[PDB]
C-alpha cells in the first residue's frame with residue numbers, strides 16, 4: 491500500500507473533465523478518512539467520512555480559507571464500511587466536484603474556491619490502506 495498520509499500532485503491544478511480515482515480499503519474499526527484538495531494552505535474541498543459522530547456515520551464536506559473552516563455540508567448516505575475495499579471517484583465539473591463511491595453517485599460540492607488551476611495537491615489521510623491514487627482527463 492501507498493504511505494498515508496499521501497500527497498498526490500495535481501499539475502496545473504484541476505479543471506472540468508479531470509477525474510481523480512482513489513482505491514483503498516478501510517481499516518478495521520475506522521474512525522475517520524479525509525480527502526483534501528488543496529490550494530496552497532487552503533482546502534478547496536475537504537471530503538471527510540466520520541464513522542462515529544454521536545454514534546452516527548456521516549460525510550462532512552467543507553472548505554478551509556486562511557486557516558478557517560466554513561459552512562459544513564453533510565451527507566447521511568454513507569457507503570464506506572470498516573474492513574472493505576472502496577473506490578472514490580471525484581469528477582471536476584464546471585460548477586462542482588461530483589463524487590461517486592463504488593460506482594454510485596454520492597454527492598456534489600459547489601466550488602467555493604474559484605481558481606481551479608491553483609488546486610494543485612490532493613492529500614489523502616486517515617484510517618485506510620491506500621492502494622492507488624491517480625487522475626485522468628475524460
Ligand SMILES: CO[C@@H]1O[C@H](CO)[C@H](O)[C@H](OC(=O)c2ccc(C)cc2)[C@@H]1OC(=O)c1ccc(Cl)cc1[N+](=O)[O-]
Nearest residue numbers: 522523524538539540542543544550552559562615616
Ligand atoms: C470541527 O472539526 C473539524 O471539522 C472540519 C470540517 O468543518 C474538519 O472535518 C476537521 O477535520 C480534520 O481536522 C481531520 C479530518 C480527518 C482526518 C483524517 C484528519 C483531520 C475537524 O473535524 C474533526 O476534528 C472531527 C470532529 C468530530 C468528529 Cl466525530 C470527527 C472529526 N474528524 O473526522 O476529524
Ligand SMILES: [Cl-]
Nearest residue numbers: 602603604605
Ligand atoms: Cl479562489
